[PDB]
Amino acid sequence: MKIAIFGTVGAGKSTISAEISKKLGYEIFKEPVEENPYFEQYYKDLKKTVFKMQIYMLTARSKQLKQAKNLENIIFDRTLLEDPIFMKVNYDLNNVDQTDYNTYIDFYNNVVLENLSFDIVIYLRVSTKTAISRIKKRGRSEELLIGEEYWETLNKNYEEFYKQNVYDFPFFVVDAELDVKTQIELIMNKLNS
Amino acid sequence: MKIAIFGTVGAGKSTISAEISKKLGYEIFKEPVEENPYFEQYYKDLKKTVFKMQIYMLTARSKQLKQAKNLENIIFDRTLLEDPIFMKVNYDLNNVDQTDYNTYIDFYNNVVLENKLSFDIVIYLRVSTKTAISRIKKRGRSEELLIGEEYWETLNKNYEEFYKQNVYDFPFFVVDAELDVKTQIELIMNKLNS
Numbered sequence: 001m002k003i004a005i006f007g008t009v010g011a012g013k014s015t016i017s018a019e020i021s022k023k024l025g026y027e028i029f030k031e032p033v034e035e036n037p038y039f040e041q042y043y044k045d046l047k048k049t050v051f052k053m054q055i056y057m058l059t060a061r062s063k064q065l066k067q068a069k070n071l072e073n074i075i076f077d078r079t080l081l082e083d084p085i086f087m088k089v090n091y092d093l094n095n096v097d098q099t100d101y102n103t104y105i106d107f108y109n110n111v112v113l114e115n116l117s118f119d120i121v122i123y124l125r126v127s128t129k130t131a132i133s134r135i136k137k138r139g140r141s142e143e144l145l146i147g148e149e150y151w152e153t154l155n156k157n158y159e160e161f162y163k164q165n166v167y168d169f170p171f172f173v174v175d176a177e178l179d180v181k182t183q184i185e186l187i188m189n190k191l192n193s
Numbered sequence: 194m195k196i197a198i199f200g201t202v203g204a205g206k207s208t209i210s211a212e213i214s215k216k217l218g219y220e221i222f223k224e225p226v227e228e229n230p231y232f233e234q235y236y237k238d239l240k241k242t243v244f245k246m247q248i249y250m251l252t253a254r255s256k257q258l259k260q261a262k263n264l265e266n267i268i269f270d271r272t273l274l275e276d277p278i279f280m281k282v283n284y285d286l287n288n289v290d291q292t293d294y295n296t297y298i299d300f301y302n303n304v305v306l307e308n309k310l311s312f313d314i315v316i317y318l319r320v321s322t323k324t325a326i327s328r329i330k331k332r333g334r335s336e337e338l339l340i341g342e343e344y345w346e347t348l349n350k351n352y353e354e355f356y357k358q359n360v361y362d363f364p365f366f367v368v369d370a371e372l373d374v375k376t377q378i379e380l381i382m383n384k385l386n387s
């Protein structure tokens with residue numbers, strides 16, 4: 001049983017994974033957030049940090065894969081293949097031009113994807129406004145520094161990623177507008193088969 | 194016979210590779226310099242472009258690998274493992290701070306170094322900084338004139354350091370690149386015939 005929890009910032013991926021990790025007793029794998037040296041920088045000045053951030057995060061994914069692909073029972077807060085979503089966002093908001101985005105996608109497919117799977121990818125589908133409010137009460141204060149446009153563009157691209165599903169994830173969709181209690185009940189049900 | 198030609202900017206790698214090819218028939222694999230959209234930008238403003246530049250370059254290297262893999266005879270103008278030299282330079286010259294440097298190499302080790310070409314000979318064209326700067330002026334690229342001498346000094350230092358440390362254990366063959374071209378080709382052909 002290899003589980004992943006998928007969705008934008010403030011979707012409640014951490015709250016959901018923790019509860020699951022309590023109920024089934026598996027280990028949660030979490031990307032560096034407190035340890036990321038570019039975190040505050042990233043939200044003050046996207047244009048200047050996007051590349052630094054991206055290279056750091058891609059290194060971290062590469063490490064997680066090393067340990068994960070020899071374990072039967074795992075829970076993943078985010079998957080390894082979701083970094084281009086944040087790039088695509090900066091591209092849409094004109095922090096990254098065509099050339100950069102072409103270099104990155106050329107980079108991603110020809111350098112990164114040379115590393116080359118879950119049982120279920122839970123998608124916490126949520127509106128922008130709700131995620132924004134969960135950043136206010138559950139997320140990192142740095143995340144409070146950029147405008148709404150960023151979060152809108154992120155949510156948009158997350159759904160886009162889910163609809164195109166280019167890696168063929170065994171997706172399962174949960175309406176995250178519901179309170180956590182219900183979300184857990186629907187997740188535990190689906191997992192029981 | 195897989196040949197790689199190794200040295201700092203203006204060592205005369207292109208001249209030497211062209212001569213060898215002329216005698217032997219082997220294909221030369223240049224790096225993208227002309228089709229590189231960051232080239233002028235990079236020399237105009239290092240700080241803002243080093244990461245963009247680096248990402249492009251490793252991407253290019255990986256393509257060259259994935260087209261020269263199966264070829265019996267190759268001549269490489271530079272190997273795929275020399276990009277960290279350029280990053281180290283910018284680190285000494287305070288274009289990149291300690292973290293960015295660590296991020297770059299942490300990525301290089303975990304992603305790039307995990308993977309393959311085996312050169313029979315890596316020909317180090319060893320030059321003084323002064324000879325290099327003049328060759329940049331003679332037959333180099335016009336954009337390479339845009340930064341101060343101190344860049345080329347550090348780059349030559351790091352190139353010498355790379356050879357002395359020989360981390361990847363290349364089969365190095367040193368050539369005195371101060372010598373005229375004709376003589377360099379004599380030394381190289383003689384070695385190649387073994």
Ligand SMILES: Nc1ncnc2c1ncn2[C@H]1C[C@H](O)[C@@H](COP(=O)(O)OP(=O)(O)OP(=O)(O)O)O1
Pocket residue numbers: 007008009010011012013014015033042053054057077082083084086087138139140143
């Ligand atoms: N590739 C990337 N580029 C830029 N920022 C990133 C990237 N990956 C992650 N981040 C940032 C955005 C968020 O602030 C944080 C990622 O974690 P996030 O999506 O918030 O999950 P989370 O574990 O906090 O659960 P949730 O927020 O769903 O409760 O780090």
Ligand SMILES: Nc1ncnc2c1ncn2[C@H]1C[C@H](O)[C@@H](COP(=O)(O)OP(=O)(O)OP(=O)(O)O)O1
Pocket residue numbers: 200201202203204205206207208223224226246247250270275276277279280333334337
């Ligand atoms: N990783 C990199 N980072 C920054 N600049 C780079 C990188 N790789 C290549 N370059 C730049 C520096 C130089 O301007 C040019 C490299 O070509 P160069 O060293 O001049 O070889 P060359 O084929 O012209 O032979 P030579 O100059 O020795 O005759 O591209």
Ligand SMILES: [Mg+2]
Pocket residue numbers: 009010138139140
């Ligand atoms: Mg969060």
Ligand SMILES: [Mg+2]
Pocket residue numbers: 202203207332333334
């Ligand atoms: Mg040159």
